[PDB]
Design a protein around this ligand. Structure first.
Ligand SMILES: CCCCCCCCCCCCCCCCCC(=O)OC[C@H](COP(=O)(O)OCCN)OC(=O)CCCCCCCCCCCCCCCCC
Ligand SMILES: CCCCCCCCCCCCCCCCCC(=O)OC[C@H](COP(=O)(O)OCCN)OC(=O)CCCCCCCCCCCCCCCCC
Ligand SMILES: CCCCCCCCCCCCO[C@@H]1O[C@H](CO)[C@@H](O[C@H]2O[C@H](CO)[C@@H](O)[C@H](O)[C@H]2O)[C@H](O)[C@H]1O
Ligand SMILES: CCCCCCCCCCCCO[C@@H]1O[C@H](CO)[C@@H](O[C@H]2O[C@H](CO)[C@@H](O)[C@H](O)[C@H]2O)[C@H](O)[C@H]1O
Ligand SMILES: CCCCCCCCCCCCO[C@@H]1O[C@H](CO)[C@@H](O[C@H]2O[C@H](CO)[C@@H](O)[C@H](O)[C@H]2O)[C@H](O)[C@H]1O
Ligand SMILES: CCCCCCCCCCCCO[C@@H]1O[C@H](CO)[C@@H](O[C@H]2O[C@H](CO)[C@@H](O)[C@H](O)[C@H]2O)[C@H](O)[C@H]1O
Ligand SMILES: CCCCCCCCCCCCO[C@@H]1O[C@H](CO)[C@@H](O[C@H]2O[C@H](CO)[C@@H](O)[C@H](O)[C@H]2O)[C@H](O)[C@H]1O
Ligand SMILES: *C(=O)CCCCCCCCCCCCC
Lengths: 126, 56, 67, 459, 171, 155, 121, 103, 79, 84
């Protein structure tokens, strides 16, 4: 039985065929990624350990994230087939669905009341 | 009725008292846990009176 | 404290914990034996269960076939 | 109402003639005195409203809104004096004058007997509010927040002006007491459909109705703290107050004209509650939470039942204190770390224990823990909408779940977990901040003892 | 990132801990731990890297099949029942700077010794920054490793938050 | 924070791609934007869709609770993947098999409950008998009317 | 047990229906059948405030037991004999229900057996 | 797979500092400098007086003179009456039951 | 401060660890950590009750206290 | 309430019940490979025995570096805030 990875259950690293095969090109990339991490760690630590620093160390990564999650969306939005189809299937469809659910229920109940068939014996709070 | 209804309500009021004291009206941090435990024990006793009347 | 930790050895016990534990264990077994001696019906049933196949057709009011 | 209008006006000379270092002490002390005297409006009778003159009247709907309005002014002053400490004296006095003039317009708006007088004061509130946001907001986007706020409002309010003037020509009067006796039914026709829309769209934008709400998260994220407090606590309730009055003259057309707006609100409340689960900005999360809460008020006002009208009034008052308190809580963090990102500063309960208690109580009211008036108002609306249609209990119930999830997500994210290591300027809470939080929650929880005074005229 | 030897030894440790979760009893575990060791010893001297990598991959597939679904976890380890239990009691040292004077007056001796540490931190900072500058390659640090102090009287660069970190049981 | 250090539009040319990778502190070979549909991602990197729980707990993270380092690009859905929310960790059992066994168990129980309701268990006894016309008055029957006489006989 | 296998796995036409029984007249094969005697009156059970499910043909023993319990308080181990008498009356009441079930079954069997005689003829 | 000569040296240097810091967390003898059976029964008698007796006086006064003066505030289930009982109010005697058959 | 019992007293002889040592010796293998587990099999840990014995804890005295009680009850039953 | 000498006493106690180690050669500074002749699989087993002894986990990245009894003592003392 082989592992069947899913969206919510990742493939274990120890079962990933890529890991056991490491070429020199891969090891170059791994070293290059550690260089970036070390450069950022130093830049963070020289402020974190500064005895005269009282405040928040601004993280441009965090600023970029909050900016992207709001301000940058519309400028890079294009109205194509996908945006309108999603836009109309989840921005007007639910309203139509609920209108018919509630309109159908209320018309059925209004008809019953007008014929005196809905039981409202003790119903005097509304 | 006068004993039954009075004791059944003192049980509940007794439980709230350690909460109210914690508004520093009369504050004894030294052994607050012992205070809370003692209140539960007294509430248990006073609740057994209306219970006995019901069983009777 | 009154009880000191030990290394790789059975712990130090007090008499009070050992005796109180034995009292409540024997109390349980006396209570079960005492209750069973008196209330075995609570375990084995309170009344006989009749065998319906042993009831005559006279008392059940079953008439003979030729009727 | 002159006994409230005139002393409110006098707060202006008091501020301008105060010693330089006493502008905050003086204006706070005397605005608290005015708030005290506002309790005299609680002389409400079982049958008749309290009708002072040909211009102003007070009933069980406007009375709580007035007391909340006059209570907020001293709170707003306390909330604003720290970030305004470097401002020069004349501009501080100007900032206070804008707050005083807002109170003047608001108390007059809630008691105006005539609907066109209500309209003029209802629009006059735009000017000081816009000035507060665009002049004393902090970031570049406050200029666009001012424009969105201004033009959304006017886009709906100008049709209202035409409809109100038309009504006065047709009926002869816009006096609300006269409209109660001279009101005539509205017959189906395309003309009356647009009269209905003109009468209601301006108030729908103020609530705001889902779909017309995008201005609100803009305004809050850019507004100063006092701007957010009045916007959330009181200005949103102008729309609800206007709807509660204008619906009188729109029957029976509201029976079917309500449907599209009930669907937007019923579905909108779920959408905006779910959006709160993913917001990264603390002020934006609270602003979106108001849209969800006011969706209930719109539904209650539109289905037009005694229980729903009582629930709407309790909800409007309860949301005002709760939402304002949440903004003040978020602002106290902002004055330390100078960011609105919710994930930036975590585990704050370890550093600010008492402030974490205010966060807990504000969250508990926001998710409407019984017997808070937040729950009383929300429960009344749920009771009334179930009779309107049993299926609505599914949407109302689902929204209750999501509301608890995002309220406690806000609490767990900022107060719990591990504190951010590099943030080392979390100074202990000030008396001013602790007092500010307690002046929100204490009146809110006290009102549970006597809910009838915030249940409105249908009580 | 992990060498072949590193991967094998992590697998050995991981397999033994999961084996122990299955066995529970010490005499049973000692028996099967020695059989498992003998399986790793069967290929200790395998010199062909391609053959050795094949063994490692199959061992990891065999581990995944036979792993305990609920392995034992040390209580304070990640995922353990006591993991992060005491984080709420860990207050950073800078909080003491904001104490009221009447609060500091209750610990005169502790706060006198704290001033010396802050004095030591202030006077040492510039040398630590200088040392890090002169020992860091031109492009920038290639690893997260930090150097010791080279001179007498110097403190290892970036020491304050390691040395003054909260105690593991701070209350 | 300058405008050049903020998210921008989708990168069209390789030169823009290299600039985006540097802005986000990533290798140019690792950087990859979201597809240029109209959804508004811009040039924000598409990082692996993994929970923060999947990250190594022993590494000295700058943010140990989030398991993030200062300056590293944050996943677009970082707030969803915090350790208090959606977990994507590998599971001892395959996801598809877990769904089959869970669904199968629930479906089987529901079927058997329907069977048990269709063929209920009961004892071999006749109806319980009550006096006074099956307690007509006690149950709330109208005193004025007359119930049909319920009669129970000895046996 | 056994009775359920016969109905669900065997012939169900000759088995009693617990929800419809009895389906034969109470005077069938029973000349001069006597009515059950209720000892406690309606007012006695109404004043004793018996739960409605308890107001059956054994209610008089339950009333006597309940009176003893109140009178013997705090001695809560008394009234054993009064309790047993109520328990025993309920056992006989249950045995009578068991006989009605067996009577219905044997009449159903007798009927089907008579139809074969007619079906054969 | 062991420490390098510089890892050993840094770890040793931080070790010395960390242990000196921990030693400095101990309190001096004077710290904190603070600003300036019959007992068992007495402490339990005073607890009962203030947590039981006073509350029961307050509640009994409240129930007797404020709650039970208004209709239907305290509603009781009426007492059970059995055959052979005597009603206190009227003196009426409830008859015994019809005689039981043998069993 | 703390006194550790002499490490030489830990011997696998006479314990189930000796059984493992014979089962491994048949295969040519040998267990090096045996004496590290020997304390768990010696001393106050040497012999523990079975499951039945754990349930019957206190049965001896509960039975005697019961034989007396019923005996006393019978004696009074004849007076 | 561990002490520096207490940690050392138990680290050596465990190693003296290890049949692959000569109890007379063992000292605090004995290198597991250079001085005691063990291999890297033995080293893993030793670290696991130290985790069992003190009841906490030493991560593999840190564990692979502990090559003598003294280094284990220093690691445990540092992890448990033992300064005396
Ligand atoms: C769209 C324009 C709607 C046109 C409405 C109209 O022209 O109605 C004219 C009519 C006047 O006729 P009258 O003799 O007074 O009374 C009998 C009615 N036939 O009847 C009326 O005058 C009734 C109209 C009342 C006033 C309507 C105000 C303008 C409505 C247009 C805006 C409505 C939508 C607003 C949306 C804003 C949302 C941001
Ligand atoms: C009307 C229905 C209303 C539906 C509302 C459902 C909201 C869905 C939750 C949205 C996510 C909010 C954030 C909460 C979250 O993500 O937490 C995830 C949490 C993880 O918890 P855990 O599995 O223990 O792992 C922790 C170890 N690291 O795990 C959780 O806590 C998530 C638990 C919620 C999962 C949905 C459960 C719904 C079950 C409904 C089916 C049963 C129907 C009722 C019973 C039938 C009647 C017998
Ligand atoms: C609406 C009803 C209100 C009723 C008001 C009654 C007022 C009575 C005032 C009593 C004040 C007692 O104040 C509170 O009592 C407890 C117990 O007695 C005391 O607490 C003390 O005694 C308890 C005894 O178990 C111990 O925990 C410990 O010795 C100490 O904490 C303190 O003194 C104080 O915490
Ligand atoms: C013909 C009809 C005209 C009607 C005019 C009626 C009002 C006339 C007022 C004249 C006196 C005004 O006095 C002038 O204003 C302010 C307010 O007191 C004074 O000084 C002020 O300084 C600061 C703020 O300004 C405050 O401490 C305080 O408000 C006051 O002391 C000036 O030093 C004085 O020159
Ligand atoms: C539904 C009833 C109410 C509807 C009211 C709608 C009328 C418009 C209200 C806002 C008016 C603001 O006026 C103008 O609007 C546009 C977008 O709308 C803003 O434009 C903003 O987004 C565009 C692209 O989306 C950018 O190119 C621009 O840099 C930015 O400023 C302007 O900055 C603002 O000056
Ligand atoms: C968020 C946006 C919400 C938008 C909500 C839209 C509501 C739509 C309401 C539809 C009903 C409009 O009002 C309806 O118009 C029709 C004309 O078409 C009127 O019809 C009237 O004139 C026509 C002329 O042909 C006659 O045949 C008819 O006998 C007469 O009733 C009705 O008197 C009125 O009932
Ligand atoms: C007292 C308790 C009473 C209730 C007990 C209810 C238990 C009922 C369990 C029903 C669910 C069984 O579900 C069934 O499991 C087996 C076992 O893998 C699966 O079987 C299949 O999957 C496995 C694993 O991938 C493969 O070897 C192969 O493809 C096949 O065997 C079926 O695909 C699945 O449908
Ligand atoms: C006879 O009275 C049977 C009582 C119930 C037995 C339950 C034991 C398990 C399931 C068997 C019930 C039979 C369903 C037809």
């Amino acid at each position: 039985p082989k592992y069947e990875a899913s969206r919510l259950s990742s493939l274990p690293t120890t079962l990933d065929p890529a890991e056991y095969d490491i070429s020199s090109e891969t090891r170059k990339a791994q070293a290059e990624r550690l260089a970036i991490r070390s450069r950022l760690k130093r830049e963070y630590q020289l402020q974190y350990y500064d005895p005269s620093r009282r405040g928040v160390i601004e993280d441009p990564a965090l600023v970029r994230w909050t900016y992207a999650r709001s301000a940058n969306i519309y400028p890079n939005f294009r109205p194509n087939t996908k945006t309108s189809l999603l836009g109309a299937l989840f921005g007007i469809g639910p309203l139509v669905f609920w209108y018919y659910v509630f309109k159908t229920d209320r018309d059925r109940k209004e008809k019953l009341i007008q014929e005196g068939k809905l039981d409202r014996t003790f119903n005097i709070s509304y | 009725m006068n004993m039954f209804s009075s004791l059944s309500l003192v049980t509940l009021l007794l439980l709230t008292m350690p909460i109210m004291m914690m508004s520093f009206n009369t504050y004894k941090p030294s052994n607050y846990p012992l205070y809370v435990k003692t209140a539960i024990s007294y509430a248990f006793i006073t609740s057994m009176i209306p219970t006995m009347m019901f069983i009777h | 404290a009154h009880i000191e930790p030990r290394y790789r050895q059975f712990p130090q016990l007090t008499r009070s914990q050992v005796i109180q534990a034995e009292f409540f264990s024997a109390t349980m077994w006396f209570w079960i034996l005492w209750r069973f001696w008196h209330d075995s019906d609570a375990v084995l049933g309170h009344f006989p269960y009749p065998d319906p196949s042993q009831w005559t057709d006279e008392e059940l009011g079953i008439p003979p076939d030729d009727e | 109402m002159l006994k409230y209008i005139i002393p409110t006006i006098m707060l202006m000379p008091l501020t301008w003639l105060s010693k330089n270092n006493m502008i905050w002490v003086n204006s706070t002390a005397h605005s608290l005195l005015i708030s005290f005297t506002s309790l005299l409006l609680m002389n409400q009778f079982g049958d008749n409203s309290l009708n002072f003159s040909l211009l102003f009247f007070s009933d069980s709907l406007s009375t709580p809104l007035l007391i909340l309005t006059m209570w907020l002014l001293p709170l707003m002053l306390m909330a604003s004096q720290h970030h305004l400490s470097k401002e020069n004296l004349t501009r501080k006095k100007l900032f206070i004058t804008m707050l005083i003039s807002l109170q003047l317009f608001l108390i007059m708006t809630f008691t105006a007997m005539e609907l066109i007088l209500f309209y003029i004061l209802f629009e006059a509130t735009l000017v000081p509010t816009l000035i507060i946001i665009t002049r004393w907001g902090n970031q570049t986007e406050r200029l666009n927040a001012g424009l969105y706020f201004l033009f959304y409002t006017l886009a709906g309010s100008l049709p209202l002006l035409v409809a109100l003037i038309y009504i006065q020509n047709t009926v002869g009067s816009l006096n609300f007491l006269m409209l109660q006796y001279w009101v005539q039914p509205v017959h189906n026709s395309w003309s009356n459909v647009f009269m209905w829309l003109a009468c209601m769209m301006a108030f729908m934008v103020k609530m705001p109705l889902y779909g017309l709400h995008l201005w609100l998260p803009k305004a809050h994220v850019e507004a100063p703290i006092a701007g957010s407090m009045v916007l959330a606590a009181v200005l949103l309730k102008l729309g609800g107050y206007g709807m509660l009055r204008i619906t009188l003259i729109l029957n029976p057309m509201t029976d079917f004209m309500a449907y599209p707006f009930i669907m937007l609100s019923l579905w909108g409340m779920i959408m905006t509650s779910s959006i709160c689960l993913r917001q990264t900005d603390l002020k934006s999360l609270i602003a979106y939470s108001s849209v969800s809460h006011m969706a209930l008020v719109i539904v209650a006002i539109l289905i037009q039942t005694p229980w729903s009208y009582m629930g709407a009034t309790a909800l409007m008052i309860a949301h005002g204190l709760t939402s304002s308190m949440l903004f003040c809580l978020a602002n106290s963090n902002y004055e330390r770390i100078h960011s609105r990102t919710m994930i930036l500063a975590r585990g704050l309960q370890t550093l600010l224990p008492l402030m974490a208690t205010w966060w807990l109580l504000a969250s508990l009211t926001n998710l409407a823990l019984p017997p808070t008036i937040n729950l009383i108002g929300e429960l009344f609306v749920v009771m009334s909408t179930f009779s309107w249609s049993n299926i609505t209990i599914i949407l109302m119930g689902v929204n209750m779940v999501i509301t608890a999830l995002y309220s406690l997500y806000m609490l767990i994210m900022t107060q719990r977990g591990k504190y951010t290591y590099h943030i080392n300027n979390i100074s202990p809470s000030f008396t001013r901040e602790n007092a500010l939080m307690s002046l929100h929650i204490l009146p809110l929880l006290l009102l549970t003892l006597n809910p009838k005074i915030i249940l409105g005229p249908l009580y | 990132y992990l060498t072949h030897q590193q991967k094998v030894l992590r697998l050995y440790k991981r397999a033994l801990r999961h084996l122990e979760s299955w066995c529970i009893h010490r005499d049973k575990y000692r028996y099967f731990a020695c059989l498992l060791r003998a399986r790793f010893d069967e290929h200790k001297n395998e010199k062909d890297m391609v053959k050795a990598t094949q063994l490692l991959r199959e061992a990891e597939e065999e581990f995944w099949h036979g792993q305990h679904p609920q392995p034992y976890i040390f209580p304070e380890s990640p995922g353990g029942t006591s993991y992060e239990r005491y984080e709420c009691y860990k207050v950073p040292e800078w909080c003491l700077d904001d104490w009221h004077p009447s609060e500091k007056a209750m610990y005169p001796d502790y706060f006198a010794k704290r001033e010396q540490w802050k004095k030591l931190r202030r006077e040492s900072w510039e040398r630590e920054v200088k040392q890090l500058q002169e020992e860091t390659p031109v492009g920038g640090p290639r690893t997260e490793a930090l150097p010791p102090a080279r001179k007498q009287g110097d403190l290892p660069p970036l020491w304050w938050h390691i040395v003054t970190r909260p105690r593991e049981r701070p209350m | 924070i300058t405008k050049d250090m903020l998210p921008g539009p989708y990168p069209k040319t390789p030169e823009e791609r290299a600039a985006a990778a540097k802005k986000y502190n990533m290798r140019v070979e690792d950087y990859e934007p979201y597809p240029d549909d109209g959804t508004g991602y811009g040039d924000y990197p598409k990082l692996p869709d993994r929970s923060q729980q999947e990250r190594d707990p022993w590494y000295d993270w700058d943010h140990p609770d989030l398991r993030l380092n200062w300056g590293e690009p944050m996943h677009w859905d970082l707030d969803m993947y915090i350790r208090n929310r959606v977990d994507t960790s590998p599971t001892p059992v395959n996801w598809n098999l877990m769904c089959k066994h869970l669904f199968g168990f629930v479906a089987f129980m529901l079927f058997m409950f329907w069977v048990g309701e269709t063929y209920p268990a009961y004892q071999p006894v006749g109806p319980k008998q009550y006096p006074y016309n099956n307690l007509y008055l006690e149950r709330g029957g109208d005193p004025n009317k007359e119930p049909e006489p319920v009669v129970h006989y000895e046996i | 047990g056994a009775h359920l296998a016969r109905r669900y796995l065997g012939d169900a036409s000759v088995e009693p229906d617990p929800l419809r029984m009895p389906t034969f007249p109470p005077d069938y094969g029973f000349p001069e059948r006597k009515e059950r005697e209720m000892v406690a009156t309606q007012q006695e059970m109404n004043d004793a405030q018996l739960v409605l499910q308890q107001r059956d043909y054994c209610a008089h023993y339950l009333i006597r037991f309940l009176k003893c319990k109140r009178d013997s308080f705090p001695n809560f181990l008394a009234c054993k004999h009064e309790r047993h008498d109520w328990d025993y009356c309920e056992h006989l009441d249950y045995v009578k229900r068991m006989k009605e079930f067996e009577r219905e079954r044997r009449l159903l069997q007798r009927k089907k057996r008579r139809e074969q005689r007619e079906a054969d003829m | 797979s062991g420490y390098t000569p510089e890892e050993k040296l840094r770890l040793q240097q931080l070790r010395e500092l960390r242990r000196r810091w921990l030693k400095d967390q101990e309190l001096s003898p004077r710290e904190p400098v603070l600003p300036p059976v019959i007992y068992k029964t007495y402490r339990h008698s005073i607890f009962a007086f203030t947590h039981v007796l006073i509350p029961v006086w307050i509640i009994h006064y409240y129930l007797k003179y404020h709650v039970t003066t208004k209709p239907y505030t305290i509603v009781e289930k009426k007492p059970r009456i059995f055959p052979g009982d005597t009603i206190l109010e009227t003196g009426e005697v409830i008859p015994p039951m019809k005689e039981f058959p043998d069993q | 401060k703390m006194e550790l019992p002499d490490y030489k007293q830990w011997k696998i002889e006479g314990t189930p660890l000796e059984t493992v040592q014979e089962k491994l010796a048949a295969r040519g293998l040998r267990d090096p950590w045996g004496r590290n587990e020997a304390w768990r099999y010696m001393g106050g840990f040497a012999n523990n009750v079975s499951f039945v014995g754990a349930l019957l804890k206190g049965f001896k005295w509960g039975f005697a206290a019961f034989v007396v009680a019923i005996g006393a009850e019978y004696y009074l039953e004849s007076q | 309430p561990l002490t520096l000498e207490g940690i050392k006493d138990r680290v050596l106690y465990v190693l003296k019940l290890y049949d692959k180690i000569d109890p007379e050669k063992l000292s605090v500074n004995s290198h597991f490979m250079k001085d005691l002749g063990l291999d890297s699989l033995d080293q893993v087993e030793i670290i696991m025995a130290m985790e069992d002894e003190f009841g906490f986990e030493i991560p593999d990245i840190d564990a692979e570096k502990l090559m003598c009894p003294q280094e284990i003592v220093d690691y445990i003392a540092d992890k448990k805030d033992v300064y005396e």
